[PDB]
Amino acid sequence: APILLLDGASMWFRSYFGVPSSIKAPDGRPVNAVRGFIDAISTLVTREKPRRLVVCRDDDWRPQWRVDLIPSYKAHRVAEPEPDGVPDIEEVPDDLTPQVNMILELLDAFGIPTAGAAGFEANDVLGTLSAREERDPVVVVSGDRDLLQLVRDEPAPQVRVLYLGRGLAKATKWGPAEVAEQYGVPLDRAGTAYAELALLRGDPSDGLPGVAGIGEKTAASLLAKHGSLQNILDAAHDPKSGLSKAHRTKLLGAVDYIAAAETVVRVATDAPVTFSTPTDTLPLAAGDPARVAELAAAYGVSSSISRLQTALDQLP
Numbered sequence: 001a002p003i004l005l006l007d008g009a010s011m012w013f014r015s016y017f018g019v020p021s022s023i024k025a026p027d028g029r030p031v032n033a034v035r036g037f038i039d040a041i042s043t044l045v046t047r048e049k050p051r052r053l054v055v056c057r058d059d060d061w062r063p064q065w066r067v068d069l070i071p072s073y074k075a076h077r078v079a080e081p082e083p084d085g086v087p088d089i090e091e092v093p094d095d096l097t098p099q100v101n102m103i104l105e106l107l108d109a110f111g112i113p114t115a116g117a118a119g120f121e122a123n124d125v126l127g128t129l130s131a132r133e134e135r136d137p138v139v140v141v142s143g144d145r146d147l148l149q150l151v152r153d154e155p156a157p158q159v160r161v162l163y164l165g166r167g168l169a170k171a172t173k174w175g176p177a178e179v180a181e182q183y184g185v186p187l188d189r190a191g192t193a194y195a196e197l198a199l200l201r202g203d204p205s206d207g208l209p210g211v212a213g214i215g216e217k218t219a220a221s222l223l224a225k226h227g228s229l230q231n232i233l234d235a236a237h238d239p240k241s242g243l244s245k246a247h248r249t250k251l252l253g254a255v256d257y258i259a260a261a262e263t264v265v266r267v268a269t270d271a272p273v274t275f276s277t278p279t280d281t282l283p284l285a286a287g288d289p290a291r292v293a294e295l296a297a298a299y300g301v302s303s304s305i306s307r308l309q310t311a312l313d314q315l316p
């Protein structure tokens with residue numbers, strides 16, 4: 001049985017856009033994201049039958065240490081920047097933010113493991129927990145393709161990304177083979193190589209311009225030929241490497257961006273993760289059944305909690 005690691009914010013944003021906003025609590029507040037997010041857990045529990053499951057939090061969705069390296073990072077998504085230490089106010093619809101609070105309440109009362117690392121993103125939590133796992137195959141559940149950098153075959157246990165780009169129902173599991181087949185990175189280091197390719201090609205939806213003149217195809221063939229990004233910069237710095245002069249000029253005109261983006265684009269694998277629960281075991285019933293029942297009533301997702309309990313009951 002795999003341990004599921006859930007990219008919480010990716011998922012309840014998906015649920016917010018995948019469940020109609022006319023699904024409301026008795027007090028009138030939309031709870032479409034809450035319903036959608038709980039149902040996704042039940043769907044995941046029934047499909048994967050995990051014993052262990054963690055909802056990974058964004059203690060800081062936009063850490064200033066990444067913004068100091070690449071100021072444009074996630075900048076088009078900031079509602080209001082907050083100074084030193086305080087996470088920036090993300091641009092989020094006014095009727096989704098209370099729903100995030102509802103979800104965290106329901107998880108806390110149920111006792112579903114959540115995890116976070118102060119000053120780090122959920123993606124770092126995901127990378128840390130998947131890097132450290134030594135017992136069970138890891139399924140990272142997310143709509144964020146950046147996480148494909150976590151895929152792993154060996155050393156065991158394997159790590160797959162159950163990718164939500166087309167929704168949960170169509171989601172398949174991505175491993176090094178799929179990543180290699182889809183982006184042209186070498187299979188023996190598909191995960192890390194994917195992150196090196198994303199650095200070079202850029203990622204506009206996160207405000208990372210990438211290296212001008214080096215698209216994804218060119219990035220792949222330079223990894224397919226030089227094996228690793230460190231090698232590409234050496235081949236560029238060494239004046240008679242086989243590198244084309246055009247490619248050298250593009251790479252040298254970007255050395256400081258390449259260096260600064262390295263730690264921005266790669267997820268941290270050694271973040272100080274803390275759990276809300278003593279362990280990452282999935283509980284088979286609510287830790288606080290009365291509060292769960294009260295919060296679900298108040299939040300208008302009683303039937304979703306009902307369906308979660310049935311999925312849990314069907315675990316062997």
Ligand SMILES: [Mn+2]
Pocket residue numbers: 064081082083084085086087088
């Ligand atoms: Mn800030």
Ligand SMILES: [Mn+2]
Pocket residue numbers: 009010121122123144
């Ligand atoms: Mn994220």
Ligand SMILES: [Mn+2]
Pocket residue numbers: 146203205206
């Ligand atoms: Mn990204």
